[PDB]
Amino acid sequence: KLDKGTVIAAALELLNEVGMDSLTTRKLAERLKVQQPALYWHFQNKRALLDALAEAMLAERHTRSLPEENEDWRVFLKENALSFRTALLSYRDGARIHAGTRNFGTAETQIRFLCAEGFCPKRAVWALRAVSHYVVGSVLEQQASDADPSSFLHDLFHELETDGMDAAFNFGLDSLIAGFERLRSS
Amino acid sequence: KLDKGTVIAAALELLNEVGMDSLTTRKLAERLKVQQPALYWHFQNKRALLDALAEAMLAERHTRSLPEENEDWRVFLKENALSFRTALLSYRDGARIHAGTRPTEPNFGTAETQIRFLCAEGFCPKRAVWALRAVSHYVVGSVLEQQASDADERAPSSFLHDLFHELETDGMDAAFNFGLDSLIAGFERLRSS
């Protein structure tokens, strides 16, 4: 009647309404029209709830973990990064929740693929981690702005807003991938 | 008698001892050997204290914020990135504190100097700002992961076993420098449209 799936769906709706800081087990119980005891063995504390929301966001939206057949390493890393970013952007404070929470089958497939595409084994692992670091940093800043000078600067900042958030993100990602080209091996 | 400099000096020592989660204004007042009103004048809540800690922790980065004469854009961006990483690593939960702080307006003078320098070095104004922001994004992501691993301390196949063993032991600096060098190498080609 009240299963894990039902609780998480209500928690994600509530997260979007009030955000990470305001989200409590009390408010979730009230949203579900149940007493607080009825949530305890699902999620014993806010930490347990946030862990489950982080997991749910990635399971739902992060689809490009594995390379597709005949896929180029540049396309794979970009699609993986775009997929991860979409997952973190899909709910309010997504990046903050992910960072506050921190599969050998998946890892081996990814590393084997990059090694075949010319990456040194260590540099394959470093490249995957570096893309993840950039995505978390970027989404944290974007979502922080959502919640919240000279003539030269004023005109430039206006022109940057016009270009949009995707343009800024893609420039950093394209630069990281372009840089891997020459540093793939010592 | 009690000034903000003396208060935050004590707050930094306490942060290293107990961490961000255990830090309270009451524990700070006790450490300073002052009464609650004396501290309350400086900070009425933990949020205000965290804001002040976050601003102080960027001291190391401010020393590498301005381009030096006879230094190219590549050395400037790398040394700036390394100083930002050192600043966030200098205290327990540094990256979490930086991330948790509501977005702060930058020094407009420092920003313009940085942007105008990159423009002189063959960046277009837009891509100069995108490059500076991209470096900051990478550093924050990297230090969050590194500090989460430290906080947590307090079977793979034959293909991955020894590889994964080597990576861990040899340290965090090689991985960070690889991502940073890749980002800067990438800027070289994408500097202008």
Same domain, A119 and A28: no
Same domain, A37 and A97: no
Same domain, A98 and A165: yes
Which residues 12-71 on chain B approach chain A with CB closer than 8 angstroms? none
Nearest C-alpha in A relative to B161: A104
Structure-block tokens of residue B51: 């804001």
Which domain covers residue B53, as residue numbers? 4-58
Same domain, B48 and B72: no
Mutate to test the interface with B, among A51, A175, A182 (most CBs of B within 10 A): A175
Task: State in Å, rounded, how far the first CA of chain B is from the last one.
Answer: 57
The residue among A58, A83, A102 that closes a domain is: A58
Same domain, A151 and A94: yes
Give the CA count within 13 Å in the CB-facing half-sphere of B74: 9
Nearest-CB residue to B108 (from A122, A153, A163): A153
Same domain, A91 and A21: no
B135, A137 Cβ separation under 8 angstroms: no
Nearest-CB residue to A99 (from B99, B159, B174): B99
Structure-block tokens of residue A89: 């952007």
Nearest C-alpha in B relative to A185: B178
Burial bucket for residue A128 (CB in 10 Å: 0-12, 13-18, 19+) = middle
Same domain, A179 and A128: yes
Give me the DSSP letters along B140-177. Answer: HHHHHHHHHHHHHH----HHHHHHHHHHHHH-SHHHHH
Nearest-CB residue to A168 (from B130, B138, B157): B130
Same domain, B83 and B10: no
B129, A156 Cβ separation under 8 angstroms: yes
Same domain, A133 and A152: yes
Burial bucket for residue A91 (CB in 10 Å: 0-12, 13-18, 19+) = buried
Same domain, A106 and A174: yes
Q: Find tokens 């091996």 and name the residue.
A: A185
Same domain, A52 and A21: yes
Nearest-CB residue to B182 (from A148, A153, A180): A180
Q: Find tokens 């960072």 and name the residue.
A: A99
Give the CA count within 13 Å in the CB-facing half-sphere of A29: 16
How big is chain B by its Cα radius of gyration, in Å? 20
Same domain, A81 and A123: yes
- Residues B85 and B90: their CA atoms lie apart, in Å, by 9
Q: How many domains does chain A have?
A: 2
Q: Find tokens 């080597």 and name the residue.
A: B166
* CATH label of the domain that carries residue B178: 1.10.357.10
Asked if A138 has any chain B CB less than 8 Å from its own CB, the reply is yes
Between the CA of residue B39 and those of B17, B26, B47, B118, B155, what are the distances in Å? 20, 9, 14, 43, 52
